[model samples]
Target: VKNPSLICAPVMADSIDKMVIETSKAHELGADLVEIRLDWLKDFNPLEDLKTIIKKSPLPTLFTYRPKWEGGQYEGDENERRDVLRLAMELGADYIDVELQVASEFIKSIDGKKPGKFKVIVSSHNYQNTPSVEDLDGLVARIQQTGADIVKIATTAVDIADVARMFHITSKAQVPTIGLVMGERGLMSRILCSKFGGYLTFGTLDSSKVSAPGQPTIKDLLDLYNFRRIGPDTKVYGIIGKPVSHSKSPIVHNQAFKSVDFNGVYVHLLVDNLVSFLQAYSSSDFAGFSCTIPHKEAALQCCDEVDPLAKSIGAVNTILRRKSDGKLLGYNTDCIGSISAIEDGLTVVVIGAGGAGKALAYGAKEKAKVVIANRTYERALELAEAIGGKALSLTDLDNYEDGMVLANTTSMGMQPNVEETPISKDALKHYALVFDAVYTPRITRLLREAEESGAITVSGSEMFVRQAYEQFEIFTGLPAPKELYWQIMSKYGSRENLYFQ
Candidate 1:
């Protein structure tokens, strides 16, 4: 995420001061460009204020005044709205944002009649839930007919499923789209636009003056999310492991950067030994990397600093750029990623007691009550004790069921053994979540079984994204967008045939 464009919708105060404050804040927070929503304000002069603001702003500007019918609060007739747009163009606004509802006559009239210098953002908004996949596709097609340079769509989200709609539409859409999920239920989509191929993400200048529901402050989004920092020149992100040529990280991460309009590349670096890989990384331009297989433990020696949790876990699958000024830093996003994969208030059960199991066990321990179940019950007990949890034999789960978050940390159900399921499909009915760390197949038998049994499923894709995203930020001082990241994953999937011999 580099030099991101920000849209400021200051709906209250109805004053130019609100726009100015939001614009100024966006500039200070590193926005390459800023957009002002004129429709949200009251008694504001478009021509005069736009000229002054565009000239004075440190970044470029997009002027928009969506009317009341299009999720905006502005009360104006068609003539009044068109007049405002025309005046804004005359005042040399960098870009003009027009709603999709504008008549074909008006759009045709403006065709070839633009200020020539300004850009256009053709937008649509649904106050209710996000549209179906088909509707989203149609919306883009319709907007394209208007010949706008960019198209934006925003809608309310009733549940987590709605977030997927925003990502799916933006990913498949041919043209660049700024898709968002409005209201408090949609905050994740707004803040994570970079990941979803959204050309712009809106933010507020002041916490109290949030223009849209679920909007976050610019400072917090940038600082916490670390958006708009990674790029091709910053440092390439990659993964190193035996047979890593098939890794989908390159496609996933690179596509994510492309969706958000950032310049970055994630590649696969195949090296036989951990020491040699570290040596190569020390002199190379790679920002950071993911270590797999036999390398995770050996990779720790290369880090300037090793996170305590990762060090204690005896395995570090992920490495990040440290915060302090120096050489590359190291962290364990795998642990946190696992925590994100499972749900709370669940009786989490992790299989396998190896290095990966330890990291995930630690993560589950922090989020919910956990039971580390492994074939090697002694090893499982050791890991569980380390993570402040208990250990149980896999056989012990025979009668135990309900609210389970079953995690597969073993490579049992991975490719070459694709038909070999680690657990019974019936067992999945007792769980609310099923997380698998085997990304090779992406959707492992364990996950498939769990999903078939009515359990919410999370694949290694989620962990791969969560950890890789952190590593990307560490190496490049930029964050990867989750939406675009998944697109890449889908396109250049984690299939064994794609990246592996």
Candidate 2:
């Protein structure tokens, strides 16, 4: 696997101290390489200024003096561009970024004399519609033939379909490549591409003057994608949570995904709220989504129809679609997915008696003998009665030694205060399986205790894959390739691990 690298997107800082602070932060955060944006700097010199900066930089550097057509801020003639590259080489720049249209002879002569010491990155930037697959492939081949150490292509994405084109390049190109889709919608691809073997990703240290549209903060992207540092063999999966920024699903699911070869990626859909999240569902592209907080109730109202059981439960955490049509149908897989994952045939103690608790009760009823233990015994008993289970007190849980299955349907162990667990560690060991609907922090104290007691562990990762598999089959009328699904999820998780690692 290729080692991950970071590209410091050139931005105009107010002063020399600001530039040093910004560039140095990227190096501190694992940026082994930096790119100098000559166009953004007002007092740039061909060799004098760059030589000084390179001497101080902690990592190897690539100097870029982009002209107007290539999305650069400045306008310079052909002679000036050639002179800049020639000067950068003489002044000891490790790599020089030359536009695709520059004279090939210049690159050949520069590399022939220096051999392994000097490298040239031949790149092209198109801030418009994504080019066809053939065009991208042809460009990569031409650059490789021109003796470029690396080839970079940046394209503009008008919609999600455009992002798909960007990935096609990486899959087909023989050489190492940097492919990007510029603009708001293209941001997801920027973070997700690392899993597909993207060489390096560009991020802005300063958020105010972002180099491209739809870019996320370096910190946010790192937090969201975490599997990169772990390894390349990991499988991936994602939870499509709307307003997902606040959800702990990433921490829980990703940790589980990594443990299994399937790295879990739980992402927040800040898309125009629930409406857009559902609209994305109408297409066969989504794997599965975890409905949360307010959207859980609103999602039920919006579906074309609901599963008979989910209809009665009043809230659906999971939705399974019908393969023949792109129908917005719902199912309470949280019930079965949660119970089956925890343990089979145990005296299950469900904490909450609300909608989520009811889901647990319904799930536990089918798989094992269950008892609802809650603060409000009446609501617990009512749910227990509806599902043919018994209602008991939390204090009474000690009486069951036949192994207890603990399910936390509440938001207790989620992020912000992830250290909290709903059940005591002492109580957790008595169970055959400990399952948390909360997958963000994959290592919940309850699950940890279950492992300590030698109880078999099941994470929300499988539930995530199973549900998403059903969703994709329903939306596309075809089953998703299990490998591809995991790859997508792991890509997001890798982005998260980059920050914490």
Candidate 3:
């Protein structure tokens, strides 16, 4: 049997000329097959258009005429829509997609048989949420009863865990199935479907022409992720945190893995319960993870071995699994990454007394005068005394006129709360440079205010990319990509306002 993990590019164009262009582009970008959404076309000459598409298409094509009810563009007569699909099959199209609701009727109309090399893909789309495992099993049996050559199930993910159910369903299926969950939270299912025995996964020709949410570009799947190289036995690595979906770690690590031809796939693991997440996935195949945010301090307690620097900093930003016995080893790269980004021998004031603040203070104390400030004075004093630094209340920040560098280690200015800064804009002029540990927005209000004040500003993304470079080296025993940070920044345009050498 053929490997079922084929990459299918969905082509939704308004004209036959546009469809032909998209089909050629899809094949050029390494798409295994093309799904031509016929409903997207403005005009309808079934025989002429279908034949033109099949003749020009560089790869196998699947025809679909989805109506408005199923979240598609087709809004024409029902019988006409069915006829277009029938005509497509008779005209030697490789496959045709029929909604499960009308699958039996469509099959009966075709005389209960498909033409040679023409297959039927019976599909279902749940816009709301994924159904229970038993319900999914029943739906699969029903799709099979319609005599489908392939089955496709798509559901929305209310939580990231819902994707696990989709993976479970795909693994136990008796026939070829394309199982995926929609929305940003379910992106992992689309990327890892092949590992669970899914028939195929969908990708867009480009970022702007997406047929569904969370669909990556065909180049991202085939080139960046090395989709064709991934298999059931491939190792899995991920970034673990509550708000992990916004992370660029997957892009950085996955690209690095591909460059070195490493047999690994990296993803975002949005973990709410750190202990349970670690316990559940403590296998060699679940290889390692990059720890972030609230989980960094907690990760230290979960490791079997710890590097002394991470132990002293009281946080673990990286974890690696032993190949021999699957034991987890913890380390911290944040201290080195952050300190390296800042100028040496300058007075540094760190805001917040959390894990990040502690790491920053511990690293900066040796060469710079470190001052700790937080909303809770006692917490700041405790961290300050441990690192041989002075403590200050957040309100007293204005009184500290001697500090040359400022670091906001709090999550105040992160996404959804971007307006909330740790200090007022008026207070930013006192510092020579400013840094914010929040990377989601790339340019926080604090960094913006500092820039306007004629101070050099650094984004959290720079620190993240630098630390990730070190983590990549430790994870795969390969040299880190030299210009990874600039490469990612240029691709996503996340740091247009920030300065970097």
> Highest TM-score, which number?
3
Q: Ten-residue segment with the worst summed lDDT in candidate 3? A: 492-501
lDDT of 3: 0.84
Model 2 lDDT per residue over 216-266, tens place = 556555654552542233222334443355444445444334344343344
Per-residue lDDT of 438 in model 2: 56
In order, the Cα lDDT scores of the candidates are 0.68, 0.62, 0.84
Candidate 2's TM-score reads 0.56
Off by over 4 Å in 1: 1-236, 243-246, 257-264, 312-314, 320-326, 344-346, 375-378, 393-401, 491-497
Tell me the deviation in Å of residue 101 in model 1. Answer: 74
The order of the candidates by TM-score, greatest first, is 3, 2, 1
lDDT of 1 by residue, 234-308 (tens): 444567665554466665565555556555455455556666546534533445678775567667777777878
Candidates sorted on lDDT, descending:
3, 1, 2
Return the top candidate by lDDT. Answer: 3
**Model 1 steric clash pairs:** 1-228, 1-229, 2-228, 195-481, 195-483, 195-484, 230-478, 232-263, 246-499, 246-500
TM-score for each of the candidates: 0.48, 0.56, 0.85
Instruction: List all candidate RMSDs to the true structure.
Output: 16.3, 10.9, 4.1
List model 3 lDDT by residue over 1-501, tens digit each: 136588999999899999999999998988999999998998869999999999999999999999899999888699999999999999889999999999999988987457888889999999999899999999999999998889999999777667777987887888888999988768778887667788889998887888988787887777656677778878888888877656777777887787677889988777778887777566576888998878998999999999999999888989999898779999998898888767532289999887788888999986668899999999899999999999998998866564489998888888767788888878887888898888868888888888898888888877777788889888888887758645865574353322110
Give Cα distance to truth, residue 46, candidate 2, Å: 2.9
Candidate 3 pairs with clashing backbones:
none
Provide the lowest-lDDT 10-residue window in model 2: 492-501
